[PDB]
Structures are given as C-alpha cells and as structure tokens.
Amino acid sequence: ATSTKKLHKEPATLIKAIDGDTVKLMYKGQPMTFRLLLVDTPEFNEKYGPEASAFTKKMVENAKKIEVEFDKGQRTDKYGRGLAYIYADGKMVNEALVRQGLAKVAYVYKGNNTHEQLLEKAEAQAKKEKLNIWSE
Ligand SMILES: Cc1cn([C@H]2C[C@H](OP(=O)(O)O)[C@@H](COP(=O)(O)O)O2)c(=O)[nH]c1=O
Ligand SMILES: [Ca+2]
C-alpha cells in the first residue's frame, strides 16, 4: 500500500481582499486571485454581500500570517483563479464565513472535498443560530 501527500499549508501575502470568497495573494512571488473552496458568499450587491466582503477583508487584513492550502484535486477554476482553503493566523476563512452564516456550502466537487464535513457542521450551526443568510 502507498499513500499520497496530506494537505499542507503554504505561506502567501495579502495583496487585496476582493469580496466575501475571493482574495488576491502574492503566492511564490506572483499575484494569484484565489477563490475559496466549498463556499459561496452573496455578491456585493445582494443581501449580506457587503457583510461577507467586510468579514473576509477584516480577517485577511488583520492576519500576520496567511496560508494557502490546496485540496487534492483541481487547483484552478476555468477563470484562472486558484482554488484553496485560506487561513488567517490558523483560522480557516472558508469555515469562518460558513459558521457566521455569510456563506453557503457550495461548489462541492468530490475531487476537492477534504473539508466538506467540517464546513457542513459549521453551516448547520449557523442555520440553528439563524445567522445572516439563514435568519429567515
Ligand atoms: C468554488 C469554486 C468555484 N468555481 C467557479 C464556478 C463558477 O463559475 P461558473 O458559474 O461560470 O461555473 C464561479 C463562481 O464564482 P463566484 O462565486 O466568485 O462568482 O466559480 C469553480 O469552478 N470551482 C470551485 O470549486
Ligand atoms: Ca460568490
């Protein structure tokens, strides 16, 4: 029996926060726009959009340490964005959004589903707490 490498976190530096689920980072010395895996925040012009954007922006701008964690499948989307879990001082932004009710679990592809159950747990707690997108 053999194994594959576990997921691992790589450093990156903030260039700018874009919206609730998109952030531009300097990764291995080149700019890359990352789309957060497994999540969908409202668009800025939709209900809770601004709040989602602001939550991510604050999380990434206040972080001393940002990390990128690719999953085991596709690394880029069809628009060229990197697909990753993003951590800010050890806290997963993807998870934090979902837990706050500012993102839905979404875009769940079996190739890239490592934190599916973690995020579904967060979503269930956000729904029970009637936060944000779940408030009605
Ligand atoms: C999260 C994620 C998004 N996407 C793409 C699909 C959506 O484009 P299509 O609708 O053209 O398929 C797009 C949504 O991005 P935004 O939610 O940033 O608007 O993100 C992936 O392809 N893979 C993924 O894992
Ligand atoms: Ca979105």
Secondary structure layout:
Layout: E1 10-19, E2 22-27, E3 30-36, E4 39-40, H1 49-61, E5 66-70, E6 82-88, E7 91-92, H2 93-99, E8 104-105, H3 116-128
Parallel strand pairs: 3-6
Antiparallel strand pairs: 1-2, 1-5, 2-3, 4-8, 5-6, 6-7
Helix pairs in contact: 2-3
Walk me through this protein's architecture.
- Helices cover 24% and strands 30% of the residues.
- The chain is of the alpha+beta class and 136 residues long.
- The protein has a single domain, classed as OB fold (Dihydrolipoamide Acetyltransferase, E2P), CATH 2.40.50.
- The protein has three helices and eight strands.
- Calcium ion binds next to loops.
Summary, kept brief:
This protein has 136 residues and is of the alpha+beta class.
Element order, helices and strands?
A: EEEEHEEEHEH
Report, as a whole number of angstroms, the end-to-end distance: 49 Å
| Major β-sheet profile | 5 strands, mixed, barrel
The overall strand count is 8
**Fraction in helix:** 10-25%
General shape: globular
Computed CA radius of gyration, to the nearest angstrom: 14 Å
- CATH class equals Mainly Beta
Strand order of the largest sheet: 1-2-3-6-5
Q: State the secondary-structure class.
A: alpha+beta
| CATH architecture descriptor text | Beta Barrel
Number of helices: 3
Number of domains: 1
Strand content: 25-35%
PDB class: hydrolase
Keywords: nuclease, hyperstable, pdTp
Assembly: monomeric
Entry title: Crystal structure of Staphylococcal nuclease variant Delta+PHS R126E at cryogenic temperature
